Amino acid sequence: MEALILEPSLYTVKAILILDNDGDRLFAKYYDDTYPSVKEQKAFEKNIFNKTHRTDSEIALLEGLTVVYKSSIDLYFYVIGSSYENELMLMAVLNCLFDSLSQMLRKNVEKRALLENMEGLFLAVDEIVDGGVILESDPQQVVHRVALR
Numbered sequence: 492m493e494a495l496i497l498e499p500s501l502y503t504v505k506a507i508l509i510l511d512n513d514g515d516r517l518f519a520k521y522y523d524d525t526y527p528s529v530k531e532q533k534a535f536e537k538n539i540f541n542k543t544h545r546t547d548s549e550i551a552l553l554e555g556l557t558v559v560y561k562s563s564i565d566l567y568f569y570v571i572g573s574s575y576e577n578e579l580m581l582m583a584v585l586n587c588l589f590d591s592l593s594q595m596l597r598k599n600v601e602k603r604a605l606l607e608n609m610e611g612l613f614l615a616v617d618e619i620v621d622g623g624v625i626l627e628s629d630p631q632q633v634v635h636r637v638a639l640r
Contacts, residue, residue: 501573502623503580505556506535507588507616508569511602514540517566518609520616522623525556539569550578559585565602572623583628584619590630591615595637611637 505523526535542553558571559581570585595611598604614637
């Protein structure tokens with residue numbers, strides 16, 4: 492007996508990034524050995540930005556990794572993961588993140604609204620995922636846990 496994930500040798504998300512419209516790192520988190528250090532993360536982030544502001548936004552596939560992404564006003568939002576059989580988990584994390592932000596910020600999740608709520612954002616990520624694996628997939632439940640912390 493074997494399977495493609497007979498062991499968790501991969502992650503549903505390898506990273507989550509949130510960049511301002513020019514590419515400034517508002518937030519980033521990584522769970523995978525490809526980019527564990529700031530210099531290589533900034534390199535991957537500039538790759539991400541180049542590969543996406545020139546593409547038909549919602550998803551891309553870059554450096555062998557699927558990434559889903561979204562943009563609003565002065566903000567770009569990204570979730571990066573493995574490409575084993577699906578991208579729906581990436582869509583799940585991105586939707587959970589954007590909507591949980593929308594509840595805590597109670598704003599258009601624009602640049603200043605994120606900057607004002609960085610801690611809430613960090614704590615939402617700490618409930619959406621753990622160790623690069625999905626942990627919760629309901630945004631208002633994530634928000635309840637962040638609010639209750």
